[PDB]
């Protein structure tokens with residue numbers, strides 16, 4: 007830096023921003039010959055490139071001025087209409103809600119923090135939860151309450167206990183943030199009883215639920231869940247979806263659905279952060295949904311990832327030593343492993359990398375960075391042949407770690 | 411709202427967000443028969459649609475996976491490289507600076523507020539200045555100091571006076587925000603002496619300059635100015651450019667160039683707000699600049715807008731009564747009018763709309779909303795025939811206002 011101590015100019019918030027000793031190490035691991043299970047990326051093989059090509063031609067023929075001009079802050083009206091038709095028919099989400107387009111769901115999470123969170127406001131998250139949601143919220147200085155998951159998603163039981171305990175301190179929760187289907191990073195899904203229980207608590211204790219759902223359509227087995235937002239009779243849920251894993255992440259288009267009063271404030275907050283989400287990509291996504299291509303393409307995404315999930319689940323079972331446990335997702339992109347006898351997976355990553363494999367250590371997914379024996383594995387973005395070999399190398403890493 | 415008093419959930423900042431009785435009326439005006447001079451949009455006739463089409467085909471043939479996948483937070487590397495080569499050759503901006511891609515310059519302004527501004531930090535702006543910059547900064551609760559413009563841009567001598575007065579109060583400015591070439595909304599340009607003087611003050615008083623430059627290539631007459639950033643030997647300037655008026659706004663791609671220490675902090679702040687700027691548009695913009703298309707297209711944008719500016723300047727001179735004054739821009743999209751005898755242009759808009767013409771009242775462009783006799787006119791987005799008739803109707807509106 008040529009200004010010298012450039013820190014003299016930074017805000018208090020900027021001074022407390024870093025990231026991340028491990029994400030930086032992982033950035034370097036990708037461009038080498040380690041088998042990395044660490045990534046969070048969808049597989050380019052699932053991008054519908056031929057449909058995209060046809061849509062780009064159609065846009066330049068019929069929609070070029072709309073695609074190329076500034077848009078409204080709220081979003082391109084035909085996309086907003088086609089998404090609400092889609093969510094209503096596909097999920098039973100109520101047309102009483104309003105919808106705003108976002109520059110990905112990441113932007114929705116930042117807007118949630120800006121619109122709802124004063125410093126010290128309490129946000130409930132799952133333990134683990136999506137690391138970039140914590141990153142978005144952290145700028146707004148909440149206090150977190152962490153609710154563990156099991157193989158049926160958030161333990162809403164423990165949420166009730168913590169709400170009663172906070173009540174007894176004269177406090178309350180403002181927002182419960184959940185990624186209830188095929189969680190990033192856990193891979194588990196909140197069952198129907200718990201979704202319903204979570205909404206009674208939302209009514210009883212008067213909080214807002216944010217339901218973040220990037221992965222619902224990436225279902226490989228089992229039957230579709232009910233969206234929490236489909237059960238939302240009080241208008242208490244803000245539902246977030248994204249085109250990132252069902253089209254391609256490169257357009258940076260997502261949507262936020264919820265109470266019109268909430269959406270209106272979100273639109274005003276968004277105006278100042280980026281004016282509008284890129285309209286060219288909104289017009290692409292509109293044709294994609296309205297033209298029936300999304301509906302036709304989803305089965306092709308599922309056919310692609312299913313065997314990758316299966317290969318990884320087969321390899322873990324065949325190779326992992328006693329006492330290692332993992333989730334068994336019915337969908338999405340991740341499998342979450344729990345190690346025995348107090349192994350620290352952040353410490354173990356050095357050894358795993360030496361043996362040719364990488365994963366994300368679980369610690370960074372916990373608001374209180376308090377659990378150290380967990381790992382997130384990704385099965386979408388490495389060749390299948392490499393899934394088996396990677397899981398074997400991870401298994402042998404764990405065996406060595408368990409000794410002396 | 412289904413939740414009742416939804417305000418009970420909003421943050422302190424959200425509670426003070428409004429939008430805006432004038433913007434809402436002008437949303438209505440655009441969809442009707444009035445001649446509106448109020449817009450801030452570039453003309454779709456200037457979008458390079460054939461070059462865009464060819465670039466889209468090229469992307470789907472050669473670059474599809476990179477355009478469609480997640481990007482790094484900092485931006486698509488070949489775009490960052492081509493913009494730095496472009497800015498170095500075209501403007502003489504130093505290659506010692508780093509560059510980050512933004513989701514438009516609007517996003518750069520929000521990130522400047524996040525990165526630099528604690529509540530109460532002092533930000534200097536021009537009077538008038540870009541209204542959405544004030545909107546971005548306002549979330550971070552700065553105090554503003556307003557420095558009037560004349561026909562040679564910011565009156566930097568009044569800036570020196572105000573810097574001395576603040577020093578005497580034990581205070582300092584953190585950031586000076588300037589739109590020094592073809593300003594939105596004033597249309598004037600800061601001359602070379604003042605650019606140099608601004609930087610001496612930046613060194614003497616130790617502040618950061620933000621140079622926001624959307625319009626520099628939209629020059630219709632005169633010789634190019636030197637970018638403030640081209641004169642910046644201390645690394646004190648953060649330079650913002652954007653593709654919005656030189657390609658099309660629909661891709662929402664801009665860039666921020668400055669000290670590597672500052673850019674690194676900006677990258678971390680951006681990561682949590684949107685992950686990355688849309689990679690598809692970045693690949694489009696990369697081919698646009700790297701393929702020499704931008705260089706070739708700039709003369710065609712100038713040829714298109716110059717007669718529109720000229721028609722509007724001719725009409726004002728022929729139709730405006732005594733005592734009305736306006737700027738005479740050498741470029742950009744706006745002409746800024748000053749009314750005589752204490753007319754309030756926000757009051758007058760009602761009469762103007764009845765007579766078939768709209769403009770933006772200047773009050774919204776002042777940090778202290780203190781000046782009331784100014785208007786912003788746009789010449790880019792109305793047909794030329796309508797420019798003449800619009801200015802005539804505005805002239806007759808003003809004559810009527812001047813009477814009892």
Ligand SMILES: *Cc1c(COP(=O)(O)O)cnc(C)c1O
Nearest residue numbers: 110111112136190220248250260
């Ligand atoms: C994939 C991911 C996102 C997607 O964010 P975008 O900005 O839309 O790409 C959001 N939430 C979770 C939990 C994710 O894993």
Ligand SMILES: *Cc1c(COP(=O)(O)O)cnc(C)c1O
Nearest residue numbers: 514515516540594624652654664
């Ligand atoms: C046009 C305008 C912008 C451009 O903003 P984008 O977000 O890049 O579209 C920025 N600054 C000023 C002064 C403007 O007039």
